[PDB]
Nucleic acid binder design. Structure first.
Ligand SMILES: Nc1ncnc2c1ncn2[C@@H]1O[C@H](COP(=O)(O)OP(=O)(O)O)[C@@H](O)[C@H]1O
Ligand SMILES: [Mg+2]
Lengths: 88, 107, 93, 98, 588, 107, 93, 95, 80
DNA sequence: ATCGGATGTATATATCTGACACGTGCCTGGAGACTAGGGAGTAATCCCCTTGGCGGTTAAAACGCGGGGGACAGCGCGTACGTGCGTTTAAGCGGTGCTAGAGCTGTCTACGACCAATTGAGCGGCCTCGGCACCGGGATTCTCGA
DNA sequence: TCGAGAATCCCGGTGCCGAGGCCGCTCAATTGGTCGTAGACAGCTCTAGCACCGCTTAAACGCACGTACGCGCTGTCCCCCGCGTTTTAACCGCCAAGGGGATTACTCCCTAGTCTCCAGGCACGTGTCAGATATATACATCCGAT
């Protein structure tokens, strides 16, 4: 019938699917996984990204740019003590 | 007179002129001694040679004649003090040292 | 424009240690980052050492103390030995 | 009857697979959507490179893998082989970012 | 007749490329073709003075061609004896042209108008190549997936004897086809698709391809198209390109297609580019045009319907310069000036509001959400749409609506349900069986579907809508041919009633900007290729004047300024110069 | 004319000539802007005011009229943002924020 | 002998906020060390921030960005407010 | 006679409330000089250096014992055992 | 004799309580001794290096402060 | 269950005593005034890379199921830990004895900065081929109910 | 209760694409002059750090009882896994556009650098009061008997 109000599902953090959590877990080395690790993991990942992206955007602001370039992200990760080799 | 590189006099393989310039236009201090770039270039070259030798050993163990970041991480994480030096460092496209906890192995 | 790099020097060292070997591009980028990072750590620590002692110059002793502070265990003594060798050779030109 | 592996074997095969490979484990577009959606907050109208997003994904996956290793150690330490949220809270609280 | 059979053992000595490394500059063929080239016309040397300073080998190439400085072909002016049918004269003319290119050790783009039966020309020509030249195969064909079946349906229609098959299906069935037939060498012509070609490179390289046909040639424009990259490895004798119309928007395109045909003439881009835009001053631009005509005349074949067969009420168009509704005004201001929306890439955002504000987040009030007059109440394009739509309905003309964004198609779905019309939608996400059923139901001789929606990008496929007579288009496209084929969908061979295009246009919005750019590109095409051969009435009258003004403006402008494409910023819109804390109660 | 301090013009309390001198003879860059010492002095003063406000609150909460290191460390640890800023900082002669695990309490 | 210190300035601010409150000596040393530590953090971040942009001056923008990068939460908000206010009042005179 | 587990909580209050040093002075100073005897012989210490060392040692061990306690509780216990130190220290990041 | 045994049983007990610990295994004392020893060796090594550079032969508090800062654990108070 | 008892803790008061807030004089560092020069601002240009949309292949994700093994609760037991008392030994404080070790002035003088020149080392852009990835097939091996 | 079956390592041939080699062009490293000034060195003073005795006082050591808790066993049941089926949505290929990122040139304002001058801050006394400590009291809590 009257249909113009199409919405989006799996908003954006549900995009980190259950099997991706499992794959990361296996590379971590775990064998059995409970049912409530998925929500907890999505929470922790979202927090980590918030911090790093905030610093990257600050660097981008300062240089008067408008593109978050890779070297900004490297700088932001470095500022948190998570140095990343391989991107400059 | 003929121009003779400062690296050659030192005998090193890294550039001492470039290290000099970077030590100067780097606001580390306002004077940079003549013998500092030499000594620093030697140290950098030693560390490079060490990690490269370990990486090449790993590459040959994996039956390859190139070095890919996986071999670099195998070399770094297999060694002990090199692992401490690159403690907080993430090597992109590296991977993980194979390791399964003993308790999870079947009986 | 003109991006400086350590690619050529890393290749010369690599041909010295493992003559019949190569290196991919990503590995070279990683090695370049490693060299800049270690240079930055050593130079920053030597800068702080000079400032701590009211000195105004970064001599060889500052670099030697910084490398003895950063590198762990066996690496420290081996690198110190080889740097000292190179300095003596250069100064006895 | 059909061949059906006993619970536990396939997990170990998967652990071997993923500790020996080296690719990325989270899909690209879902992660990029997440990054841009997060970054809408701090500054509107931002545009990213591609290397920026790849660097973010590298750091993210490395962080999560290390967290899961510590989680597994905690779970084993309690005479279990199953990881539950309490393990993750404990791991992060010990690490120092509660 | 007169050929060896499909003995796979016999074929394997011809299909497979035995010398897996054998590949040379081919100096003799280069010299022969380039000599004939210079013979027919002389400017072609302009390539070699440059590429020879570029090439140490073209030193001696130029030398060899420079020391020196069956008259009538087989004028096959009949319906081919072996093809079981009849050919209308320009078909035979194209066949003769293809043969003539074959003899001069070159080949040319076929770029006739759609519906002219180009693939019949191609099948006839390959059959000529087989029966008369004693060469069965092989050949390769690349087509859009949709027409994969048509190629075979006509291969097995005119020249039944030849063998053909498709690399249709997923990995296992394609793989067994590969191993059984393809590497078994049991064919004469293959039929793959763009995706297949990119996905079956390793086996398809292993064949001494005789030609490489390509339906819908214009897919090869970006010379870094990985499809093009792949096709630069298929060793072949010559090539062939079929496209309804080349030279879509830029001129660099035709150089790309030429690279595909003859990479040993058009091998460099700088010469083409500078030779073309080689008159900053504008007295010799007509001479440049005549030069380009005398350049491309041999290679390219182009035909028009409007001169090969009439019986086609030509079409007519109107560009209804509609105004802007009130909330459209406010939303345009809000977009231009200004809650996650990611307003960046705004020229798309403007095309959203300029068609319907409801496309945004909650422009329509609610919840609750109700379908009523408030839809058309405040969307100027939709207002005039309803008015003209009623006028057509009382006359009773089936209507086809095209759009760029399917969200507007959904809005139209809602509005159509509101107005008691039976609609039919074939969007990009529709399933194939649903697609064919929908188009058949609309094409049923007793159909009540007043409206047939579809996006313009999806409209270029092999779908046939000769049934209707009005093809109203909301928004003009960036590529004027992109929607021109869409308009042609209803004007193909078979339509009798006048087609009545209504490309809708807004005023003072970016719509005029986009329309101007599209007109520039269309004029460029026309110049380069033509010479080779509230009340509806008041708005109608107002709009049929500014459109005349615009076409008069672009009717004669310099080629230079025609391609300059001034970056007139749209950021004016009547004037615009943008784009303590918590304390613990007790510490005891 | 008579000398009118840059601090007074700023209206701050922390020195600006001293901050200027340090930023200059501290090898942070080649040239120090004119406004930078003003900004930095204001920020340092603001942070000091926060720490001292909270610490004095705590000191009053113990019937004492002097911030001692225990009060500084207690005020810092009670807040969340200061506790995050000085996360890796051990304040000498501070102590541990009182805390008992609930599971340990008798039943 | 001259050991420079932020003793008198801290004490001025303390008298400003808690007018009738003292401060010990160990507390004073801790507060002074705190001021120095945060000073070098901000200055070092501004130095690196200038060097990244191939810039050779420590303006007030670099100080502001370093404040935004080190200070967490609304400490950042209030501190940037304070700095902006002071620099404006300064330039006006 | 107090039931077992009573005096422990009062000990915890006593010590989570105070601020002094907990390790004796001279035993720690002797330990410091003995450890330093390896890197260079004939070495002197200014007393403030030893006080700094003791403050850092105290704080490190106290935080270590908090994390040990959390690990013990997480395994449904109230007794701390060496496996808890090892787990806490490996997780923290020095193994 | 046995300098690290100078870290008595009850001193470790006091530290454990200030950490919040109620009951203690008998084997904690040896591992606590080991952990303390490793921490001290790291810090003292870096402090001695710093005093080597300056040519002195005394380790002043400010050197220990520098060494701790380098280890990643600042110490307000004594320094500055 | 409650209560009375015993123990430990929070509270009010007097005393000191050692550190803090104060006052002074001196000097060195900050502010006023001025000049020169070069860094950064601001225009203006080019084209590289980003932004959104679309379509087709194909693998991954979502879903439901059947079943077993592991997470959790309950019981017993026995053992190691806590509490409290008695003993003893070491920390801490003080005092003897000495000298080297670390912080101020004044003079060179070698060495690092600056400047001109000029050449060669290094960087970018363009090749070609060998090392790696892909694939197919075969023997090996580990798992799991008989 | 070993034989069936599914996953794995090895070998082999082939394709392909990224590393390595060559070649020109430019700018920054080396030569080579000069010359200032950091710092090295040798006076100075002053004061904090190094193997022995005596004494007080409490914290560490040692020990016995009991008890509650850590550990092991059993049962239970229900959550999680392995698997087969179906949907869906990455991923790659693609189209369009313009922003804005990086570059260049020129002027001028702002900043370093010098001179001059004086006042803010720093070290040296100094008096008194905020907090520590001891005592006695009130009260809050624990715990075993009835
Ligand atoms: N004998 C004939 N002569 C000319 N045209 C024919 C003949 N038979 C069929 N055709 C038409 O020629 C068309 C060939 O395909 P065409 O529509 O030209 O493909 P495209 O759309 O790619 O140009 C067929 O669709 C068919 O309608
Ligand atoms: Mg076709």
């Amino acid at each position: 019938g009257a249909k113009r109000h199409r919405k989006v599902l799996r908003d954006n953090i549900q995009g980190i699917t259950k099997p991706a959590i499992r794959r990361l877990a296996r590379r971590g080395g775990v064998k059995r996984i409970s049912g409530l690790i998925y929500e907890e993991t999505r929470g922790v990942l979202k927090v980590f990204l918030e911090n790093v992206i905030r610093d990257a955007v600050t660097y981008t602001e300062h240089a008067k740019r408008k593109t978050v370039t890779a070297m900004d992200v490297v700088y932001a990760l470095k500022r948190q003590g998570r140095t990343l080799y391989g991107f400059g | 007179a003929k121009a003779k590189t400062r690296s050659s006099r030192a005998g090193l393989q890294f550039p001492v002129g470039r290290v000099h310039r970077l030590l100067r236009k780097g606001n580390y201090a306002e004077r940079v001694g003549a013998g500092a770039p030499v000594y620093l270039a030697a140290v950098l070259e030693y560390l490079t040679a060490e990690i490269l030798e370990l990486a090449g050993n790993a590459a040959r163990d994996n039956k390859k004649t190139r070095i890919i970041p996986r071999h670099l991480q195998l070399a770094v994480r297999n060694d002990e003090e090199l692992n401490k030096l690159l403690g907080r460092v993430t090597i992109a496209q590296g991977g993980v040292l194979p390791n399964i906890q003993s308790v999870l192995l079947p009986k | 424009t003109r991006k400086e790099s350590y690619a050529i020097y890393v290749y010369k060292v690599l041909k010295q240690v493992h003559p019949d070997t190569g290196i991919s591009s990503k590995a070279m980028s990683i090695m370049n980052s490693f060299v800049n990072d270690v240079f930055e750590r050593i130079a920053g620590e030597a800068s702080r050492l000079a400032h701590y002692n009211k000195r105004s110059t970064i001599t060889s002793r500052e670099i030697q103390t910084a490398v003895r502070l950063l590198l762990p265990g066996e690496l420290a003594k081996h690198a110190v030995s080889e740097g000292t060798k190179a300095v003596t050779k250069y100064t006895s030109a | 009857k059909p061949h059906r592996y006993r619970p536990g074997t396939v997990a170990l095969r998967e652990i071997r697979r993923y500790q020996k490979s080296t690719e990325l484990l989270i899909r690209k577009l879902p992660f990029q959507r997440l990054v841009r959606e997060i970054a809408q907050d701090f500054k509107t109208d931002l545009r990213f490179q591609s290397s920026a997003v790849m660097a973010l994904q590298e750091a993210s996956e490395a962080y999560l893998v290390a967290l899961f290793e510590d989680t597994n150690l905690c779970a084993i330490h309690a005479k279990r082989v199953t990881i539950m949220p309490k393990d993750i809270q404990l791991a992060r609280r010990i690490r120092g970012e509660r | 007749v007169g050929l060896p059979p499909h003995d796979p053992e016999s074929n394997k000595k011809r299909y497979l490329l035995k010398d897996a490394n054998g590949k040379k500059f081919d100096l003799e063929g280069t010299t022969k073709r380039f000599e004939h080239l210079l013979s027919l016309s002389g400017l072609f040397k302009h390539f070699i003075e440059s590429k020879a300073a570029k090439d140490p080998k073209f030193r001696q190439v130029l030398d060899v061609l420079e020391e020196n400085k069956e008259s009538i072909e087989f004028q096959f002016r009949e319906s081919p004896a072996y093809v079981n049918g009849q050919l209308r004269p320009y078909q035979i003319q194209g066949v003769n042209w293809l043969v003539s290119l074959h003899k001069n050790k070159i080949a040319g783009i076929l770029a006739d108008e759609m519906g002219l039966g180009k693939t019949l020309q191609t099948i006839s020509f390959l059959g000529y190549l087989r029966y008369i030249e004693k060469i069965p195969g092989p050949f390769l064909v690349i087509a859009p997936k949709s027409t994969l079946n048509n190629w075979l349906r006509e291969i097995n229609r005119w020249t039944p004897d030849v063998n053909a098959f498709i690399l249709q299906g997923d990995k296992e069935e394609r793989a067994e086809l590969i191993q059984k037939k393809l590497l078994g060498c049991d064919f004469d012509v293959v039929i793959a698709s763009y995706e297949i070609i990119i996905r079956e490179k390793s086996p398809l390289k292993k064949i001494n391809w005789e030609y490489i046909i390509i339906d819908e040639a214009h897919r090869i424009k970006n010379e870094e198209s990985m499809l093009s990259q792949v096709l630069r490895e298929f060793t072949s004798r010559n090539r062939l390109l079929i496209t309804g119309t080349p030279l879509q928007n830029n001129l660099h395109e035709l150089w790309a297609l030429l690279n595909f045909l003859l990479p040993d003439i058009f091998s460099d881009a700088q010469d083409f580019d500078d030779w073309f835009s080689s008159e900053s001053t504008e007295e010799d631009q007509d001479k440049i045009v005549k030069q380009l005509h005398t350049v491309l005349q041999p290679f390219l074949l182009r035909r028009i319907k409007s001169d090969v067969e009439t019986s086609l009420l030509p079409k007519k168009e109107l560009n209804l310069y509609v105004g802007m509704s009130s909330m459209q005004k406010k939303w345009y201001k809000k977009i231009l000036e200004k809650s996650k929306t990611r307003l960046l890439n705004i020229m798309m955002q403007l095309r959203k509001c300029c068609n319907h504000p409801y496309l945004f987040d909650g422009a329509e009030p609610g919840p609750p959400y109700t379908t009523d007059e408030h839809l058309v109440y405040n969307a100027a394009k939709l207002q005039v749409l309803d008015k003209l739509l009623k006028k057509l309905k009382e006359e009773g003309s089936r209507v086809l609506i095209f759009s760029q964004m399917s969200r507007l198609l959904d809005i139209l779905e809602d509005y159509c349900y509101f107005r008691n019309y039976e609609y039919c939608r074939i969007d990009g996400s529709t399933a194939h069986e649903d697609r064919i059923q929908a188009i058949d139901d609309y094409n049923a001789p007793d159909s009540k579907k007043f409206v047939f929606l579809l996006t313009t990008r999806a409209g270029g496929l092999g779908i046939n809508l000769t049934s209707a007579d009005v093809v109203v288009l909301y928004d003009s496209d960036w590529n004027p041919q992109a929607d021109l084929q869409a308009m042609d969908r209803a004007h193909r061979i078979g339509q009798k009633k006048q087609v009545k295009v209504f490309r809708l246009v807004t005023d003072n919005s970016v719509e005029e900007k986009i329309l101007e750019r599209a007109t520039q590109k269309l004029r460029l095409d026309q110049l380069v290729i033509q010479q080779n051969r509230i009340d509806l009435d008041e708005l109608l009258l107002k709009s049929e004047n500014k459109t005349k003004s615009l076409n008069a403006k672009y009717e004669t402008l310099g080629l230079d300024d025609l391609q300059k494409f001034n970056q007139d910023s749209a950021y004016e819109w009547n004037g615009q110069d943008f784009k303590k804390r918590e304390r613990k109660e007790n510490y005891s």
